[PDB]
Design an enzyme around this catalytic site. Structure first.
Site, PDB file in Angstrom:
ATOM      1  N   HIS A  39       0.680  -1.309  -0.117  1.00 27.42           N
ATOM      2  CA  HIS A  39      -0.034  -0.030   0.075  1.00 27.42           C
ATOM      3  C   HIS A  39       0.919   1.250  -0.019  1.00 27.42           C
ATOM      4  CE1 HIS A  39      -3.216  -2.835   0.807  1.00 27.42           C
ATOM      5  NE2 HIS A  39      -2.713  -2.866   2.224  1.00 27.42           N
ATOM      6  N   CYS A  89      -4.572   4.855  -2.131  1.00 27.81           N
ATOM      7  CA  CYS A  89      -3.584   3.837  -2.419  1.00 27.81           C
ATOM      8  C   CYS A  89      -3.417   3.753  -3.832  1.00 27.81           C
ATOM      9  CB  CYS A  89      -3.879   2.593  -1.700  1.00 27.81           C
ATOM     10  SG  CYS A  89      -2.716   1.183  -1.972  1.00 27.81           S
ATOM     11  N   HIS A  92      -3.993  -0.113  -5.347  1.00 24.56           N
ATOM     12  CA  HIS A  92      -5.303  -0.635  -5.040  1.00 24.56           C
ATOM     13  C   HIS A  92      -6.387   0.639  -5.492  1.00 24.56           C
ATOM     14  CE1 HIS A  92      -3.258  -3.581  -2.152  1.00 24.56           C
ATOM     15  NE2 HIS A  92      -3.460  -4.052  -3.277  1.00 24.56           N
ATOM     16  N   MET A  97      -9.538   1.897  -2.801  1.00 24.28           N
ATOM     17  CA  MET A  97      -8.973   1.913  -1.414  1.00 24.28           C
ATOM     18  C   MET A  97      -8.622   3.468  -1.580  1.00 24.28           C
ATOM     19  SD  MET A  97      -5.698  -0.358   0.211  1.00 24.28           S
ATOM     20  CE  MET A  97      -5.274   0.165   1.706  1.00 24.28           C
TER      21      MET A  97
HETATM   22 CU   LIG Z   1      -3.295  -0.524  -0.927  1.00 18.48          CU
END
Ligand SMILES: [Cu+2]
Ligand SMILES: [K+]
Ligand SMILES: [K+]
Ligand SMILES: [Zn+2]
Length: 105
Positions: A39, A89, A92, A97
Site C-alpha cells: 500500500h 492507495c 489498489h 482504496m
Molecule cells: Cu492498497
C-alpha cells in the site's frame, strides 16, 4: 489524540480502516500496514485544502509499504489548514482504496 488507520481491513478487504477520520489540530493519524500489501498513501494536489501541491506532496507517502506493521504518521498541527485531505492507495486505486481526513476548525 492518535488515530490508527489500518491499510487493508482485517476482513481481507482492500480498504483503509477506518476510511474516514475526523481530527482536531494537534492530533496524529498513524497508518499501519495490515493485510494485502503493498500500500501507499497519496494526496493529489487538488484534494487538500487550498489545492496546495506543496502541502499534498509533503504529506504523500508514495513509497510502497510491504511488511505488516510498517507505519507512517502525520501530526496535523495548528500549522495545517482546516478542511478535507482525501487520499488513495495507488496499487489498489481500482479497488476503491481511498480515505479522507477531516481537520476541524
Ligand atoms: Cu492498497
Ligand atoms: K488524493
Ligand atoms: K497516482
Ligand atoms: Zn493532480
Amino acid at each position: 489524540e492518535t488515530f490508527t488507520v489500518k491499510m487493508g481491513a482485517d476482513s481481507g478487504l482492500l480498504q483503509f480502516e477506518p476510511a474516514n477520520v475526523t481530527v482536531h489540530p494537534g492530533d496524529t493519524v498513524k497508518w499501519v500496514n495490515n493485510k494485502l500489501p503493498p500500500h501507499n498513501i497519496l494526496f493529489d494536489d487538488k484534494q487538500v485544502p487550498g489545492a496546495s501541491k506543496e502541502l499534498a506532496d509533503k504529506l504523500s507517502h508514495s513509497q510502497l509499504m510491504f511488511s505488516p506493521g510498517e507505519s507512517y504518521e502525520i501530526t496535523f498541527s495548528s500549522d495545517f489548514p482546516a478542511g478535507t485531505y482525501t487520499y488513495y492507495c495507488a496499487p489498489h486505486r481500482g479497488a476503491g482504496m481511498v480515505g479522507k481526513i477531516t481537520v476541524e476548525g
